[PDB]
């Protein structure tokens, strides 16, 4: 292996990296964010200006922080499906 | 090349005669067996 790395290079591209008890939280966050983006992209009907993922993710993070601090987190203009999905994912994270 | 890429478990295991091979499940009647087991559990 040493001689191969000496005469070949890193070959670093295309290699996977296992989750090793220090990346667990930072990877769980990625998976949850991807899942919420998927649900957002699905429940929005056709031609409803899809450019709204980042703000909904910000709303989800704020809801999680409010739950951690025991604050109601009640938002005026949020549509019902988005609010329900955010509550669902926040409950998942809280149970974890 | 790597420690975990070395040969290991080179013999694949197949279901034996009494472990529920495709032949045994095909010969078996799963519907009636399921009904008897459901009734038996209900009995408790």
């Amino acid at each position: 292996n040493l001689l191969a790395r000496q005469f070949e290079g890193r070959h670093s591209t295309g290699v996977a990296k296992q989750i090793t008890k220090q990346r667990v939280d930072s990877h769980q966050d990625l998976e949850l964010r991807a899942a919420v983006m998927n649900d957002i992209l699905d429940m929005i009907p056709e031609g409803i200006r899809q450019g709204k993922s980042k703000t909904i993710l910000q709303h989800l993070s704020e809801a999680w922080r409010c739950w951690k601090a025991n604050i109601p987190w009640k938002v005026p203009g949020l549509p019902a499906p988005i609010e329900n999905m955010i509550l669902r994912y926040v409950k998942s994270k809280a149970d974890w | 090349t790597s420690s975990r890429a070395l040969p290991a478990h080179l013999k694949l295991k197949y279901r034996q005669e009494s472990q529920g091979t495709e032949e045994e499940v095909r010969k078996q009647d799963l519907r009636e067996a399921l009904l008897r087991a459901e009734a038996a559990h209900f009995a408790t």
Partner: protein, 391 residues
Amino acid sequence: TVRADSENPSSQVITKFSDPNKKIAGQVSMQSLEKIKGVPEAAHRIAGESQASLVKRTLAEQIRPEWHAPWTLMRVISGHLGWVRCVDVEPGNQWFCTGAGDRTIKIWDLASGVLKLTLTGHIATVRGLAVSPRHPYLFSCGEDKMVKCWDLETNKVIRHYHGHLSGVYALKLHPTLDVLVTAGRDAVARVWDMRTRQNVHVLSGHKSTVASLAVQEFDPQVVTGSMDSTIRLWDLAAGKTLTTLTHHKKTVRALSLHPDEFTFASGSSDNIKHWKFPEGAFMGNFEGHNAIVNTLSINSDNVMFSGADNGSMCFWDWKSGHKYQELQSVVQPGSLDSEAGIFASSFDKTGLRLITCEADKSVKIYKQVDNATPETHPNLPWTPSNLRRRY
């Protein structure tokens, strides 16, 4: 100018004399409109061909539905501590295993629901299980990026399959070969030889996460549906795609093979469609389930079940494409209204019991009402010939 007068007969002889009953309600009365001037050499022939096409469509959407009996809840198993994401039934139909978000794989007794041992060893959520019908193995995959092979004779992990850049969302086993396929967030479906843990094929054709999978023995052997709303039919021998199906508008989260008819159904947020395999020919819609369809399970006696992300449950008649029962899943007592959901489902080997995995930390088992009697348990009413489908 009174060139002619008295539409008195014309106004009646025109409307009356034809087939009395409406055929497709838009029938142009082919014989009536020759006599106009215009361009009959081309336009008339095209119009006649189009009329034939529409009458064929409207007549072919009128299959009489069958009865099929309704379904009811019979058991509610509540042991998991997270969303239940996958389910599989062992070939002998004695037990089934479900993974969940609590990192655990729980093996239940199918007849009684009594919990057999609980398997641990996953770091993140488990997203796919498969009990090999030819080996005493149980493969599992999860969002922790590794695929495990559990030896069911010792209840211990023996094999690890490593190459995956992100979480893995589906896992299927080839019915004949000693090979398994997993698909995940890296927009790639990977083909692993079971024995040597080698990634022989990297089926990389999609643009986003491959949310669904399906494997069979006939070509197409691997069918992957992804976030792109595109379904790709793969040639496993060469590792190249044959047919791409772009009919869906949103991500296709459910793929399911018909056990006996060599057709498969795929579902998405908008519509459920089914195809004939060799060329992927579209064969019709299952309209009516306006929800995020997560699961599709086809029975042996042509019954399809579609579970939605909001707990909506619709049972379909496979032949006629008719939704004969609407059921709403009810959450177990501690849950929220937003916690009504379904992620995985599967008919048992017989096909008489339906297992449902909930976004509720509960597993629900459904059973047909045993009394039958089509007179006393009518399905949803069927109304024909409203209009041709827009398509």
